[PDB]
Amino acid sequence: MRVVVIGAGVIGLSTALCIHERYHSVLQPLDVKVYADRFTPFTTTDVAAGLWQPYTSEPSNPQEANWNQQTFNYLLSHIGSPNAANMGLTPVSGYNLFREAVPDPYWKDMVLGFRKLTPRELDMFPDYRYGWFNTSLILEGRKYLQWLTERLTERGVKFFLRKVESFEEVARGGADVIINCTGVWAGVLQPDPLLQPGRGQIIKVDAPWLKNFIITHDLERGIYNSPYIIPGLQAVTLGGTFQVGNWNEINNIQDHNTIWEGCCRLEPTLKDAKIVGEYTGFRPVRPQVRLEREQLRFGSSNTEVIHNYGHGGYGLTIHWGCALEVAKLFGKVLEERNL
Amino acid sequence: MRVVVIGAGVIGLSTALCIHERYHSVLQPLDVKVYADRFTPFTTTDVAAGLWQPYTSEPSNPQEANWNQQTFNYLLSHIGSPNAANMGLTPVSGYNLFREAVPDPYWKDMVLGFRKLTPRELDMFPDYRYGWFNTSLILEGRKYLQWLTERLTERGVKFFLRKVESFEEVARGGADVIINCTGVWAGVLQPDPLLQPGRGQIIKVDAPWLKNFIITHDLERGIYNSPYIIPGLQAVTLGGTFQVGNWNEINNIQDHNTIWEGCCRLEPTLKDAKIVGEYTGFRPVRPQVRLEREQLRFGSSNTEVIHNYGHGGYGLTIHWGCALEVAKLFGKVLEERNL
Numbered sequence: 126m127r128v129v130v131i132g133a134g135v136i137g138l139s140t141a142l143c144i145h146e147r148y149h150s151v152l153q154p155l156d157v158k159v160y161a162d163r164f165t166p167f168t169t170t171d172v173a174a175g176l177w178q179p180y181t182s183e184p185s186n187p188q189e190a191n192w193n194q195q196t197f198n199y200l201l202s203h204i205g206s207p208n209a210a211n212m213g214l215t216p217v218s219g220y221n222l223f224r225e226a227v228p229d230p231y232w233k234d235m236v237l238g239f240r241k242l243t244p245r246e247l248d249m250f251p252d253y254r255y256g257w258f259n260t261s262l263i264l265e266g267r268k269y270l271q272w273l274t275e276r277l278t279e280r281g282v283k284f285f286l287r288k289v290e291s292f293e294e295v296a297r298g299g300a301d302v303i304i305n306c307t308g309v310w311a312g313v314l315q316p317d318p319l320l321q322p323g324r325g326q327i328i329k330v331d332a333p334w335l336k337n338f339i340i341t342h343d344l345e346r347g348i349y350n351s352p353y354i355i356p357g358l359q360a361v362t363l364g365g366t367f368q369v370g371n372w373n374e375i376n377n378i379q380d381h382n383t384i385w386e387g388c389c390r391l392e393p394t395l396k397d398a399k400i401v402g403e404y405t406g407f408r409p410v411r412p413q414v415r416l417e418r419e420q421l422r423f424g425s426s427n428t429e430v431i432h433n434y435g436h437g438g439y440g441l442t443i444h445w446g447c448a449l450e451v452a453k454l455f456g457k458v459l460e461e462r463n464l
Numbered sequence: 465m466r467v468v469v470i471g472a473g474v475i476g477l478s479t480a481l482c483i484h485e486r487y488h489s490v491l492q493p494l495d496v497k498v499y500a501d502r503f504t505p506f507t508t509t510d511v512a513a514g515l516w517q518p519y520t521s522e523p524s525n526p527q528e529a530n531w532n533q534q535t536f537n538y539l540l541s542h543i544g545s546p547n548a549a550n551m552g553l554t555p556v557s558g559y560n561l562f563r564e565a566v567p568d569p570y571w572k573d574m575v576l577g578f579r580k581l582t583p584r585e586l587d588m589f590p591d592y593r594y595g596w597f598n599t600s601l602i603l604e605g606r607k608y609l610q611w612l613t614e615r616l617t618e619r620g621v622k623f624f625l626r627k628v629e630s631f632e633e634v635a636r637g638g639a640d641v642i643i644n645c646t647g648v649w650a651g652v653l654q655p656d657p658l659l660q661p662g663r664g665q666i667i668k669v670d671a672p673w674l675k676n677f678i679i680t681h682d683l684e685r686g687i688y689n690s691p692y693i694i695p696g697l698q699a700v701t702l703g704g705t706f707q708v709g710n711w712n713e714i715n716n717i718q719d720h721n722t723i724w725e726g727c728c729r730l731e732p733t734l735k736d737a738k739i740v741g742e743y744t745g746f747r748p749v750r751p752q753v754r755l756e757r758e759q760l761r762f763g764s765s766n767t768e769v770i771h772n773y774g775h776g777g778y779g780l781t782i783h784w785g786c787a788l789e790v791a792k793l794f795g796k797v798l799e800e801r802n803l
């Protein structure tokens with residue numbers, strides 16, 4: 126069966142893998158290919174802060190929290206193996222600062238060791254008045270992508286520089302199924318005003334002494350508009366913006382400073398950190414994730430699509446969960462074809 | 465007044481500073497000098513794992529805990545300033561593993577966020593069955609030493625790479641008050657069978673993805689004979705030995721392997737960590753710290769000594785506390801001299 130996964134961000138890959146991993150030898154032939162106009166280091170995924178942490182607010186389609194939970198476990202499960210950092214994974218602990226008290230996140234129990242910070246702790250940051258502490262995981266985009274890639278590759282999945290113009294295209298081509306994991310740019314293949322770019326610029330900097338993440342929150346300014354600092358496998362990511370509907374893909378000096386000054390302020394020692402890079406990306410913002418099946422008639426032949434997009438600022442945090450669901454639907458699709 | 469501090473490890477320096485800091489302009493002249501046959505990077509201090517963490521067992525002296533507490537606060541107080549990492553400080557969180565349950569450490573409340581680990585957590589390190597979690601501080605030897613040094617220097621203390629041979633000699637120089645902070649080698653200036661070398665070899669390795677410390681414990685094997693891993697300002701320190709009465713100062717291949725293999729099991733990712741150095745040092749082991757005053761008659765002239773040594777494996781963890789006490793006695797000494 127000809128399957129075509131469009132997009133090679135964390136979503137496309139995991140998904141592809143997951144499907145193949147689950148059905149390769151459940152169905153004999155099973156042909157998977159991945160088309161994408163961008164591959165790492167060019168995906169949005171490549172620019173994510175790399176932390177597992179869903180938004181504070183309980184998800185609209187409640188199953189999302191499961192996907193999140195499932196993603197976290199899967200990840201955690203790897204922590205212990207030798208390859209975990211080779212997958213781009215590692216545990217990290219850190220803070221979430223606030224200016225006023227606030228309700229515990231629904232994921233309070235998915236993460237390890239969640240607890241409200243004490244005053245002494247808070248004294249470590251004079252701006253904030255309230256916050257939490259917990260340990261979690263770093264799952265780095267680029268590395269994970271490459272891992273995922275090698276995995277798929279050895280599994281025989283094939284990749285292709287392609288810019289799909291239409292699903293039609295792909296279908297006239299031969300795809301029995303098509304899995305749309307085109308991120309923000311999904312709208313192009315089929316409009317979806319729900320979907321929008323959540324622009325975010327960041328700065329990578331070299332400062333090995335920071336071992337914990339620190340994420341501040343301005344309830345007014347909106348989420349991820351406040352300074353944040355996230356240690357990674359080697360560099361640290363300085364961050365602070367999330368602009369909806371903004372599509373400029375260039376790093377802007379203004380933002381650069383607002384990030385630089387804000388973090389520097391939050392974390393004073395940053396004064397000596399050396400900047401090694403700046404990047405900007407589009408969070409595939411959407412009220413909810415679109416992950417559902419859709420049949421498409423072209424001539425006398427039907428073609429199956431399965432959407433998986435709009436993971437906003439938690440694409441990594443919940444990638445796996447969805448990847449599973451798709452496989453699930455994908456399966457139903459096979460049942461209907463009678464295998 | 466002529467003061468002479470012998471030794472330039474973390475102990476000598478802090479102490480010197482502390483004295484000067486407190487009495488420089490309480491007394492006018494005040495002449496401080498520091499003699500030491502070894503200066504960083506050569507002190508024992510230079511090789512410490514760099515973590516704030518007193519031993520598990522309840523203190524011999526009641527005062528040790530306070531010194532520890534005082535040291536921790538002083539340190540913590542700096543976390544927030546821009547220079548903290550320039551002093552060689554940063555917060556780090558981590559684990560303490562055990563094979564059987566065990567009583568909470570007395571310092572449970574001095575550290576930030578102490579708590580017993582949960583099972584999921586424990587699943588992360590399968591050979592153990594029990595343990596704790598808390599956040600604390602890294603205070604790196606070398607860096608701190610240099611910091612301390614620049615500070616003293618600008619304060620006008622003067623340094624001399626010199627091997628003192630006798631208290632007698634120093635006193636004979638014109639030394640009004642000698643401050644003894646000669647670490648394990650203290651015995652030489654005046655015997656003390658209580659004092660012994662707590663040999664420890666370690667391996668520095670480059671592995672930036674490890675962000676938390678992990679210290680295992682073998683109740684039989686003795687303290688710090690078990691593998692431990694401690695992230696630092698740039699490298700990670702692999703460790704695992706504490707041999708009493710051993711004075712070989714060379715790194716030994718068997719230790720190197722027992723450390724390497726033990727940590728590597730504890731933390732399989734090191735499979736890819738690159739070794740960048742190996743070192744060995746003597747913990748100035750002693751049943752309890754010697755920190756007390758002692759007068760010494762030489763000819764028709766008395767000379768005041770204040771001992772400060774035998775901080776075993778917590779010299780950093782408690783340096784400041786003692787430094788204060790000395791200043792205190794030092795003061796009494798001034799009172800007696802009627803200022």
Ligand SMILES: Cc1cc2c(cc1C)[n+](C(=O)C(C)C)c1c(=O)[nH]c(=O)nc-1n2C[C@H](O)[C@H](O)[C@H](O)COP(=O)([O-])OP(=O)(O)OC[C@H]1O[C@@H](n2cnc3c(N)ncnc32)[C@H](O)[C@@H]1O
Nearest residue numbers: 132133134136162163169170174175176308406440441442
């Ligand atoms: C930008 C950004 C995102 C962050 C982020 C910080 C930043 C700056 N933070 C944070 O905000 C921290 C502060 C907490 C994280 C984080 O720390 N944790 C977390 O879970 N999430 C975070 N994300 C969100 C995450 O990056 C995003 O959800 C995923 O990358 C989406 O992956 P994808 O595969 O759907 O898109 P993407 O990676 O762009 O994959 C899209 C793919 O489809 C391809 N494509 C599209 N259309 C076509 C076409 N027509 N033909 C061919 N190929 C096509 C494109 O080439 C690419 O292959």
Ligand SMILES: Cc1cc2c(cc1C)[n+](C(=O)C(C)C)c1c(=O)[nH]c(=O)nc-1n2C[C@H](O)[C@H](O)[C@H](O)COP(=O)([O-])OP(=O)(O)OC[C@H]1O[C@@H](n2cnc3c(N)ncnc32)[C@H](O)[C@@H]1O
Nearest residue numbers: 471472473475501502508509514515628647745779780781
């Ligand atoms: C070796 C070692 C120690 C560790 C350690 C791991 C290792 C391998 N860990 C751990 O074990 C982790 C696993 C938790 C830490 C840790 O992580 N945290 C912690 O708090 N403690 C730890 N320590 C213990 C600490 O290093 C030690 O207490 C202090 O360095 C003592 O400083 P000092 O100034 O008294 O001696 P040292 O630094 O040797 O200063 C001695 C000074 O006196 C000088 N000197 C002596 N005699 C003379 C003389 N006759 N003439 C001139 N100069 C003289 C010598 O030149 C030097 O200047």
